[PDB]
Write a protein that binds this ligand. Structure first.
Ligand SMILES: [Ca+2]
Ligand SMILES: [Ca+2]
Ligand SMILES: [Ca+2]
Ligand SMILES: [Ca+2]
Ligand SMILES: [Ca+2]
Ligand SMILES: [Ca+2]
Ligand SMILES: [Fe+3]
Ligand SMILES: [Fe+3]
Lengths: 491, 304, 82
């Protein structure tokens, strides 16, 4: 007979001891551990809710991979590249480039906790997290690999994180900040609680459903399978927060949650916002991006924060406001500078689409519609020179995304600037500036892509110079309009 | 910009390979953090973690112009590792099941449960130290193919911890007055036979240079564990009519030999730079006496 | 005497890098910014364009140069109509 897990599982994490040949601080240095001076004895109270054991892990994960690869093999003849809506193919290119090597980087945030967390349960769950993120990085390289032969843009599934392309810098500056560049307890709070529990879990669920709607069952099944892994390691941040809150560090816990949610939001708005409201074909639109945020993201944050004895972030009103506005401008930025993206943005402004945008965001036509009016007129009169940029956008020194506002009738745009140690920094929100000021040594000498351009690092100091700096290797790699301006026919 | 045709594989592999292996597709050249020497991470160059990586990875006295070219001799990916380990672990779970049905633990020789309580169950601490240490080599190593070997080694370390946890509990059921599952922390911290091992691991876990961490963990500590812990434990089990423990250990030994094999492949790769021979030698010379003292104090406790 | 500024044009959705000259009048500045915006994503208007420090209530005189303005390289300006 076998003895049930509950009977012996406690021994798996009975692994704290009192060091005596080195000190506790040498073994768990605050810069890598982030224990905030709380002693080893106290971290033994760490109470993660969900259990995983090594024999169970290897068996279930073997089965999950068998299924995912069998589906891929079975659907090889689906002709997804050829038959999909361009909006879907661009969804895939953007997804794989922003995500695949980022999942691999998450192995490192997990490893940071595996070695440096004072909580024994955290150390074991993070080992499984290391494994899970390895799976995800490998899956999301192996799957798009078939597409390299079809389209050079799929090379960016591997290449994006090895590039200085602006959106890649945005993703790396975010991930390097919350995953690979901080102590163990920060990673627990910023990655597992704030990003994975707060965003990616629900995002992947939505993405898998969109994939199925798009008729791509290999991808739908891939993303579903990956999402099933999430709770196993995403669970780690809540208990760390509870323990900090119990041990006199509520203010520090709240600050780290506040920063990580904001940072996650800005990247989410540029990468996923536009996909949902502009790329996904109209008739296949389940809901809008704001509806997604309201159904899947906002209330969930509110309730889990309440559950921990934490509060809504100081900026909550701003966040809710941003949901109405930000991604519409980020989309316009991505589309107008499309030649700088490794995917082909869909404009998403047929009259039919504009009606949808109006009912989802009342006043859309009087704001973003004004800009899209000018753009559409230029396309219809074959003034294509006026539909491509001849300068660079100004970029936030935190998010690494262009500084945007509300255009048209309600024109409002604000840059939050800061002089610090003799340099002028510009931010895209009050919150981005605040995040900088919470931890200046993390950020202060970083140069954004425009800082680099002005400093002489990008040669020649021109559009074409920038594109070569950003790592484009051929004409075909640079983003174009997804539908080759066919939308203008409906105008 | 010119027109170029689609490549059959990733741009970094396309010159050399028409159809690279699954291993190469999913494993090769993933540490973007080695691209910018003065800014590993996309942050201020002097951010704390940037300073950590510049000191402990980039500046290691163990040097190679092409770490990214290291290849796991077994070429394991997540998928193939779980194929392999679900096999091995299902075998071990069947061993536990069947030996439990046979009432194995009741058949062991007088006193063996006390030897197990003192010399076997506290290995959960040692194995957890290997787990933590393999995690550290993972996060610091200067190539994704090296880090991947460490990932899988970290998991194997937890595998062994979990066996030890399961068998400590199971054994305590037959022998409830032996302290099994209640005294391991005390033994690890205070029993002289464990102090060599504990000092060794405390010191190893605070060697932060990636090269020193690799060489001390994988070239010194881990082979000492094979020869001075796992093998003598098998011998003792034999002498005490414990036939489960040697079969369990043979499974764990397959894991240890795999770790040995990749480690030896990394040394072969490192030795392409002739300056590395003396560096690796010097770390071995440094760590060996501590490991030999650990082994010696353990072996005599095991037999006492 | 290249002088980078970040400029937000009335009715547009972003701030952009625009490189002006140290001795450009505000009239000339507005013209260099308008080039990256008007008929690209802002409809053209008749009227005079004015330049101010970002978010400021006060407008710079049309004939003031950026040298005279007290502006420093990489500061943020708005370009707006009367
Ligand atoms: Ca690498
Ligand atoms: Ca008996
Ligand atoms: Ca008793
Ligand atoms: Ca017990
Ligand atoms: Ca006890
Ligand atoms: Ca002046
Ligand atoms: Fe993941
Ligand atoms: Fe995850």
């Amino acid at each position: 007979a076998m003895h049930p897990r509950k009977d012996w599982y406690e021994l798996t994490r009975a692994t704290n001891w009192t060091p005596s040949y080195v000190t506790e601080e040498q073994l768990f240095p605050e810069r890598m551990s982030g224990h905030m001076g709380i002693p080893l004895e106290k971290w033994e109270s760490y109470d993660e809710p969900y259990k995983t054991s090594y024999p169970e892990y290897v068996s279930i994960q073997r089965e999950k991979d068998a299924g995912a690869y069998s589906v891929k093999a079975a659907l090889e003849r689906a002709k997804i590249y050829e038959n999909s809506d361009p909006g879907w193919i661009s969804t895939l290119k953007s997804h794989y480039g922003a995500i695949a090597v980022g999942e691999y980087a998450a192995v490192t945030g997990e490893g940071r906790m595996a070695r440096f967390s004072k909580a024994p349960g955290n150390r074991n769950m993070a080992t499984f997290g290391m494994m899970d993120e390895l799976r995800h990085g490998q899956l999301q390289l192996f799957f798009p690999h078939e597409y390299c032969k079809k389209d050079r843009q799929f090379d960016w599934a591997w290449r994006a994180y090895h590039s200085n392309e602006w959106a890649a810098i945005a993703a790396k500056h975010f991930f390097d900040d919350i995953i690979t560049g901080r102590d163990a307890i920060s990673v627990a709070i910023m990655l597992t609680f704030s990003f994975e529990t707060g965003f990616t879990n629900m995002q992947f669920l939505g993405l898998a459903a969109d994939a199925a709607e798009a008729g791509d069952y290999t991808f739908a099944n891939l993303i579903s399978s990956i999402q099933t892994d999430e709770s196993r390691h995403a669970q780690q941040g809540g208990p760390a927060l509870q323990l900090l809150i119990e041990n006199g560090k509520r203010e520090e816990a709240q600050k780290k949650v506040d920063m990580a949610i904001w940072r996650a939001w800005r990247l989410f708005a540029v990468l996923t916002g536009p996909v949902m409201d502009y790329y996904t074909p109209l008739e296949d639109r389940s809901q809008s991006f704001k509806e997604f945020m309201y159904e899947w993201i906002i209330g969930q944050f509110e309730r889990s924060l309440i559950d921990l004895g934490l509060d809504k972030p100081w900026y909550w009103d701003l966040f809710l406001k941003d949901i109405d506005e930000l991604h519409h401008s980020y989309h316009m930025g991505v589309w107008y500078w499309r030649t700088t993206a490794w995917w082909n943005p869909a404009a998403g402004v047929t009259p039919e689409e504009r009606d949808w945008l109006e009912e989802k965001y009342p006043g859309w036509n009087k704001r973003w519609g004004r800009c899209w009016d000018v753009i559409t007129e230029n396309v219809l009169n074959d003034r294509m020179d006026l539909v491509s940029p001849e300068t660079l956008p100004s970029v936030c020194n935190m998010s690494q995304i262009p500084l945007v506002g509300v255009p048209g009738d309600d024109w409002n745009i604000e840059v939050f600037s800061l002089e610090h140690n003799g340099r002028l920094y510009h931010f895209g929100s009050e919150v981005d500036r605040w995040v900088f000021q919470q931890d200046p040594v993390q950020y202060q000498n970083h140069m954004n892509i425009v800082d680099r351009f002005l400093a002489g690092q990008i040669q020649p100091m021109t559009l074409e110079g920038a594109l070569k700096y950003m790592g484009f290797q051929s004409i075909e790699e640079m983003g174009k309009d997804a539908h080759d301006f066919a939308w203008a026919d409906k105008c | 910009f010119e027109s170029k045709k689609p490549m059959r594989t990733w741009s970094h592999l396309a010159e050399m390979r028409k159809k690279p292996s699954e291993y190469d597709i999913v494993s090769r050249k993933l540490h973007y953090s080695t691209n910018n020497p003065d800014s590993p991470w996309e942050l201020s160059p002097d951010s704390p973690m940037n300073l950590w990586y510049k000191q402990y990875r980039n500046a290691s006295p163990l040097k190679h112009d092409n770490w990214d070219a290291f290849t796991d001799p077994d070429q394991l990916v997540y998928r193939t590792y779980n194929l392999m380990q679900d096999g091995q672990e299902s075998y071990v779970q069947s061993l536990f099941d069947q030996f439990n049905e046979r009432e194995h633990d009741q058949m062991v020789r007088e006193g063996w449960e006390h030897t197990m309580a003192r010399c076997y169950s506290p290995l959960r601490y040692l194995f957890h130290c290997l787990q933590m240490s393999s995690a550290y080599v993972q996060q610091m190593a200067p190539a994704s193919t090296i880090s991947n070997c460490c990932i899988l080694q970290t998991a194997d370390s937890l595998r062994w911890l979990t066996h030890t946890a399961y068998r400590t509990h199971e054994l305590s059921l037959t022998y409830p007055d032996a302290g099994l599952g209640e005294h391991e922390r005390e033994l690890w911290e205070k029993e002289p036979g464990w102090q060599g091992l504990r000092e060794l691991m405390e010191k190893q876990l605070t060697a932060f240079d990636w090269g020193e961490a690799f060489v001390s963990l994988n070239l010194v500590v881990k082979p000492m564990i094979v020869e001075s812990i796992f093998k003598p434990l098998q011998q003792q089990a034999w002498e005490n009519n414990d036939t489960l423990l040697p079969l369990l250990i043979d499974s764990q030994l397959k894991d240890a030999e795999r770790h040995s094999r990749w480690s030896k492949a990394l040394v072969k790769h490192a030795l392409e730079n002739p300056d590395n021979h003396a560096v690796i030698e010097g770390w071995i010379e440094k760590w060996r006496p501590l490991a030999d003292r650990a082994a010696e104090a353990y072996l005599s406790m095991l037999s006492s | 005497s290249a002088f980078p500024v970040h400029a937000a044009f009335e009715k547009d959705f972003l701030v952009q890098l625009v490189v002006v000259d140290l001795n450009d009048s505000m009239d000339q500045v507005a013209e260099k910014v308008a080039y990256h915006c008007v008929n690209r994503r802002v409809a053209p208007r008749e009227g005079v364009m004015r330049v101010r420090k970002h978010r400021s209530t006060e407008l710079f005189p049309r004939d003031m140069t950026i040298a005279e303005s007290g502006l420093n390289p990489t500061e943020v300006i708005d370009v707006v109509f009367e």
